[PDB]
């Protein structure tokens, strides 16, 4: 987006400046080219000339004002995608009750009782649990007062800027490429879930290429469904975006909100309004209040779903801007936020689409670094999606999600103190798909120090999960 | 071309025809897969279901319609080649006089005094001498009257079709694929020479890759010139056409005549007209009159030059139809009728040009039949032109024209009765370039029966010819 104002204020919004991610026994074995993101400007690992406070906001390079022609094309593409979406999901998009929004429904997880509450509550020393009863699904007077202002479209707010404490490639760490989490007020998250929670639940439950969304998928079971689909097409492309979320222009966000979240599709009138509050945002970081026009705040209630919807519309828009006679059946795709797999029996020229994505303020490149240009004839077994390859399992013939061994090494090499046993069992579920030899190697540093699930136990659990999903379908 | 009509006529042409060719003592040694063409439907060598008088015309399978876009491209290619051609030759293309046309000029041989006169003269038992005085270069009243009809563009004529008495592959012999020659009326040949005779003389004088024509060349002396030129290029192709002459479409022929023989290039306006009389023709064969639209009559005046001009335009057309930014400098070529060598530093995809030549009704294949596909990186020492390879002579450092030993064996295996000694001395001039061992082997069958020139004598004669040029 475009930074239109940066001012200093009295009340400092403090930031965590020390990582909680300590090296494990595995770190000394794997010596990974990964480490915790820099959380301080004084981090000695940062390259000469890197100012952390500047680099973390450098993604804000402007808000593309789209041409009359392009806004008209974008609107018809958003309407065509919405028609497909609401045809598959239906139009039962009535608001969730306060209770449903807190507790969740079929296809939507409950709200987190003890995550950051956002502003102004963080400055008042108030936790989420002081504002909302998560057990009984009721709100206190402070949240109820804010919900009244949202009903009347008078609610205003600031986003709280958190640096994301996480493992990154060391090249990105040294460059000061620490990622930001935008924490919105808990009441804003609650009202968003009331307005579009049912729709999000339906999106999760109906994930697949037909709606172009993998949000809410289970890679263990759904890799077989996704893999079998994409295996049937002559050409497959995985596309990398540069700062996808930051580069959503006001025009694209506003037009998408207008076409997807219409009252005629069963939404409360304030569905469009609460989403439009994300376009022009104030960001609190230390003593800085930064006003940004355009871009999706990174970590709102429906960030993944909103990013996925925009990704689907961007592909239809780009193809229609380059080609005559492009329809939703010209290609197939699945997206999870900025992540995307596209396929077609047509020899689509993805290199030629680069300037068409640029008209939306988006920069696309091949996810593969064999070439800086897009090429034809790639298959589902060449692409990365959610950091996972599609590999055919020898034992079953099922597609399984395989992560890069170097990435699994990096994940195993760091942990928050007292979480190693828990993390090992979690990562075991990811590593099983690398096969028995790689599984053994990855967990060998932990042998006799922690419980490591048997390869066989996790393999059988996986086979049963895919087979159970197939037996259900029959 | 399209055969639009076939009808039986009472004023028939020929009688029962036998070959003048007989085997030589070489036939039994070399056993060539070649023999005299069938000249009779009753030839016992002919396959079942062969009708000779039909097969000889079977090349006429239609007159290809070119799209408006292809016609426009062809006209630009014809104009662009004409521009290069007349830049080299100049525009001194004024009509010859009757005298000059009969007697010839510098670069144009005199007309033949006693060859076939054509129709209707042949049926009236007239020879060329009864119509034209060749010694004094004057015409009688019959030819004078015909010339006046041509001035008025009212002249009409039939082509007299003769079978070609010659050696053919035995496959072609058995299939009844005897080649034909069209004898046009002597006055038509006369007027054609009057209209484009100076041009044809300049074509002969300036033969070479710059005008893309080898017509009038002397392979003995000119292979050095041609070989040196083509040796400079990364890629060389030799291209084979199927029935090149027959498959010139009316669209292509008319546009070529209109762009090459323009009055602004110094031609009389009837140069275009007399050439356009070749497009829609009547052919007299025995008792048959066959009307054809499209194709070149094989053996009209300037057949070789016309076919060569079309070959040049076809290559520019095909390359420009496939590729962006093609000009005359993109490639080089030389042609003799359907025979062609093309070269370029560009890796031109000749396989991809196949459909582009097909838009002209022409079917191209590699001249090298050891593969049905065109390839890159062939050189001048790989290709065949006028049945001759380009070999570097060790003794001189000059290119020499080398015929395949199988070609020379076939040539030596037959001769017109009473001509063997004359033929052997002629063929010795072709065979010397194969080197002393192959020269000795080729003439071994004739030793003690005929005088065979020494390899040494013909080699020294050749050295003088190329050093003299």
């Amino acid at each position: 987006g475009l930074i239109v104002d940066t001012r200093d204020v009295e009340e400092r919004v403090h930031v965590m400046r020390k990582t909680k991610l300590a090296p494990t026994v595995a770190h000394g074995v794997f010596n990974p080219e990964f480490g915790p993101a820099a959380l301080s400007n004084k981090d000695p690992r940062l390259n000469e000339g890197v100012v952390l406070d500047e680099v973390i906001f450098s993604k804000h390079k402007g808000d593309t004002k789209m041409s009359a022609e392009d806004k008209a094309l974008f609107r018809r593409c958003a309407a065509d995608y919405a028609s497909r979406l609401h045809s598959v999901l239906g139009t039962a998009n009535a608001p969730l009750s306060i209770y449903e929004a807190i507790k969740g429904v079929d296809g939507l997880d409950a709200m987190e009782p003890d995550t950051a509450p956002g502003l102004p509550w963080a400055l008042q020393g108030k936790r989420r649990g002081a504002l909302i009863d998560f057990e009984n699904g009721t709100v206190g007077p402070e949240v109820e007062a804010a919900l009244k202002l949202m009903e009347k479209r008078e609610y205003k707010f600031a986003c709280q800027t958190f640096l994301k404490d996480e493992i990154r490639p060391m090249e990105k760490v040294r460059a000061g490429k620490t990622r930001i989490v935008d924490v919105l007020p808990v009441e804003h998250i609650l009202y968003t879930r009331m307005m579009i929670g049912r729709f999000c639940a339906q999106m999760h439950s109906n994930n697949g290429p037909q709606i172009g969304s993998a949000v809410g998928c289970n890679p263990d079971v759904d890799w077989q469904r996704f893999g079998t689909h994409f295996a049937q097409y002559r050409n497959v492309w995985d596309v990398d975006y540069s700062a996808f979320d930051a580069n959503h222009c006001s025009d694209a966000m506003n037009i998408m909100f207008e076409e997807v979240f219409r009252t005629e599709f069963g939404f409360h009138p304030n569905a469009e309004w609460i989403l439009k509050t994300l376009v022009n945002t104030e960001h609190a970081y230390e003593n800085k209040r930064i006003t940004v026009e355009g871009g999706m705040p990174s970590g709102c209630s429906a960030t993944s779903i909103i990013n996925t919807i925009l990704n689907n519309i961007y592909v239809l828009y780009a193809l229609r801007r380059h080609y005559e006679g492009v329809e939703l059946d010209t290609y197939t795709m699945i997206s999870y936020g900025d992540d995307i797999v596209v396929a077609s029996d047509y020899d689509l020229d993805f290199e030629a689409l680069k300037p068409h994505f640029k008209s939306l303020g988006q920069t696309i490149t091949p996810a593969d670094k064999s070439d800086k240009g897009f090429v034809l004839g790639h298959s589902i077994t060449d692409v990365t999606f959610l950091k996972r390859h599609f590999h055919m399992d020898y034992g079953t013939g099922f597609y399984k999600p395989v992560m890069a061994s170097k990435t699994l090494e990096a994940i195993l090499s760091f942990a928050r103190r007292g979480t190693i046993q828990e993390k090992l069992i979690s990562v075991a579920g990811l590593a099983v798909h690398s096969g028995p030899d790689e599984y053994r190697r990855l967990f060998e540093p932990f042998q006799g120090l922690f419980e490591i699930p048997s390869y066989r136990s996790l393999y059988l659990r996986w086979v049963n999960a895919v087979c159970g999903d197939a037996a259900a379908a029959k | 071309g399209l055969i639009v009509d076939t009808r039986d006529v009472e004023e028939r042409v020929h009688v029962m025809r036998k070959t003048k060719l007989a085997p030589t003592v070489a036939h039994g040694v070399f056993n060539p897969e070649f023999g005299p063409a069938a000249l009779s439907n009753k030839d016992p060598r002919l396959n079942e279901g062969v009708v000779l008088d039909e097969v000889i015309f079977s090349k006429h399978k239609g007159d290809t319609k070119m799209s408006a876009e292809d016609k426009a491209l062809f006209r630009r290619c014809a104009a662009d080649y004409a521009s290069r051609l007349h830049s080299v030759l100049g525009t001194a293309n004024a009509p010859l006089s009757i005298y000059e046309a009969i007697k010839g000029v510098d670069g144009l041989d005199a007309m033949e005094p006693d060859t076939a006169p054509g129709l209707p003269w042949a049926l009236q038992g007239k020879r060329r001498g009864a119509l034209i005085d060749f010694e004094n270069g004057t015409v009688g009243p019959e030819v004078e009257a015909a010339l006046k009809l041509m001035e008025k563009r009212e002249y009409k004529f039939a082509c007299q079709t003769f079978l070609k008495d010659e050696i053919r592959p035995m496959e072609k012999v058995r299939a009844g694929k005897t080649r034909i020659v069209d004898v046009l009326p002597v006055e038509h040949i006369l007027y054609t020479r009057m209209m484009i005779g100076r041009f044809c003389a300049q074509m002969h004088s300036n033969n070479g890759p710059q005008i893309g024509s080898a017509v009038g060349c002397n392979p003995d002396v000119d292979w050095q010139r041609f070989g040196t030129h083509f040796a400079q290029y990364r890629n060389v192709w030799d291209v084979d056409y199927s029935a090149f002459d027959a498959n010139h479409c009316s669209d292509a022929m008319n546009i070529m005549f209109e762009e090459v023989f323009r009055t602004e290039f110094g031609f009389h306006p009837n140069a275009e007209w007399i050439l356009k009389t070749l497009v829609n023709t009547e052919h007299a064969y025995e008792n048959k009159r066959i009307t054809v639209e499209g194709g070149m009559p094989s053996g009209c005046s300037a057949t070789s030059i016309i076919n060569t001009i079309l070959n040049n335009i076809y290559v520019l057309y095909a390359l420009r139809r496939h590729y962006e930014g093609v000009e005359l400098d993109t490639y080089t070529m030389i042609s003799y009728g359907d025979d062609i060598v093309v070269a370029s530093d560009y890796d031109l995809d000749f396989e991809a040009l196949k459909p582009h030549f097909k838009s002209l009704g022409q079917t191209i294949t590699p001249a090298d039949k050891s593969d049905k596909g065109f390839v890159l990186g062939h050189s001048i020492t790989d290709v065949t032109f006028l049945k001759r390879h380009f070999h570097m002579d060790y003794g001189t450092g000059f290119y020499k024209p080398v015929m395949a030993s199988k070609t020379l064996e076939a040539i030596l295996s037959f001769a017109r009765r009473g001509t063997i000694q004359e033929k052997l001395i002629s063929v010795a001039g072709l065979a010397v370039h194969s080197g002393p061992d192959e020269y000795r082997r080729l003439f071994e069958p004739f030793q003690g029966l005929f005088e065979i020139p020494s390899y040494r004598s013909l080699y020294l004669r050749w050295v003088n010819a190329v050093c003299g040029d």
Partner: peptide, 17 residues
């Protein structure tokens, strides 16, 4: 199928080397 919007009616190859 899908045809380009800005292509001319001369779909001709570039000269190689």
């Amino acid at each position: 199928g899908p045809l380009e919007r800005q292509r001319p009616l001369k779909v001709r190859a570039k000269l190689p080397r």
